[PDB]
Design a protein around this ligand. Structure first.
Ligand SMILES: CO[C@@H]1[C@@H](O)[C@H](O)O[C@H](CO)[C@H]1O
Ligand SMILES: [Ca+2]
Ligand code: NA
Ligand code: NA
Length: 305
């Protein structure tokens, strides 16, 4: 069988666990393929050693989810010896690293796109629901529940949901913005506080960096008899999708693990086979990179889930 080596930066990452399991399923549908999976345990030196072992096993391609993005060059140098193609995924190597090797590719999507996609989703519903503009000023008076401060996804989603609304011509007024640390109960408490203070009747839209915090806000709104205020999240968790179905959550955003896995596997398998990376697929490779869009989820596409 054609051997393909895969390294996951750490097995205790939820998103990468979904991606890993999807890669494993995809490989099961390719009987000519033997997948050699590795948990790098959040240690780049461990990952580097795991790559040494993979290469001694004659892998025909490497799919590498780096612990340290700066280690791309190190990995490429190992791959060169046997001219093994490398499909980096989820952690983006530098442009210089990708351009250094004719058989280096990347599959992944900037975190800021989750904010952009969430902003577009909010814009979509805002425009379709002019009654949401409670004070009729043409601006969204919002509150924002932020993930852990300094976490790249908290920072990206917070910055870019507002930038994208504003860029789409929708002025916003930030009535409150605080962290609830990705947590449902913390978010419920924070939203409760806001609904008990001077801004209670001014809030038009609740924006959360994830579904957990969105759901806490949903509960707080219900308790204050303000369920008519729309709430938006990110993650497309099943318990959140249940709320999209019931109308309690206005929308959420999928980080598309299945398609990250599929593009990674498809490219790796083609490259292992000595074929063009996108041969027989509909992936768009743009200067060695496949971007996998975040997807806004609401009542239009909910049946797909
Ligand atoms: C473990 O912390 C994770 C965070 O890394 C992820 O981006 O977003 C998640 C929120 O759904 C957090 O629970
Ligand atoms: Ca308004
Ligand atoms: Na991403
Ligand atoms: Na609501």
């Amino acid at each position: 069988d054609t051997r393909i080596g895969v390294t996951i930066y750490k097995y205790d990452d939820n998103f990468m666990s979904v991606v890993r399991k999807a890669i494993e399923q995809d490989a099961k549908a390719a009987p000519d393929v033997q997948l050699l999976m590795n948990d790098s345990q959040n240690d780049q030196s461990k990952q580097n050693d795991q790559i040494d072992v993979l290469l001694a096993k004659g892998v025909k391609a490497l799919a590498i989810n780096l612990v340290d993005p700066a280690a791309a060059g190190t990995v490429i140098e190992k791959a060169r010896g046997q001219n093994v193609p490398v499909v980096f995924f989820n952690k983006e190597p530098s442009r210089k690293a990708l351009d250094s090797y004719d058989k280096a590719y990347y599959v992944g999507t900037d975190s800021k796109e989750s904010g952009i996609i969430q902003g577009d989703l909010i814009a979509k519903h805002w425009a379709a629901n002019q009654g949401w503009d409670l004070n009729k000023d043409g601006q969204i008076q919002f509150v924002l529940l932020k993930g852990e401060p300094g976490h790249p996804d908290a920072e990206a989603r917070t910055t870019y949901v507002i930038k994208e609304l504003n860029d789409k011509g929708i002025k916003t007024e930030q009535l409150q913005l605080d962290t609830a640390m990705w947590d449902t109960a913390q978010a419920k408490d924070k939203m409760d506080a806001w609904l008990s203070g001077p801004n209670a009747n001014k809030i038009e839209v609740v924006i959360a960096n994830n579904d957990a915090m969105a759901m806490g806000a949903v509960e707080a709104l219900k308790a204050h008899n303000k369920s008519s205020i729309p709430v938006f999240g990110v993650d497309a968790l099943p318990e959140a999708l249940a709320l999209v179905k019931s109308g309690a959550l206005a929308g959420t955003v999928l980080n598309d693990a299945n398609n990250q896995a599929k593009a990674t596997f498809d490219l790796a398998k083609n490259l292992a086979d000595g074929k063009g990376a996108a041969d027989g697929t509909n992936w768009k490779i743009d200067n060695k990179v496949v971007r996998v869009p975040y997807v806004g989820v609401d009542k239009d596409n909910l049946a797909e889930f």
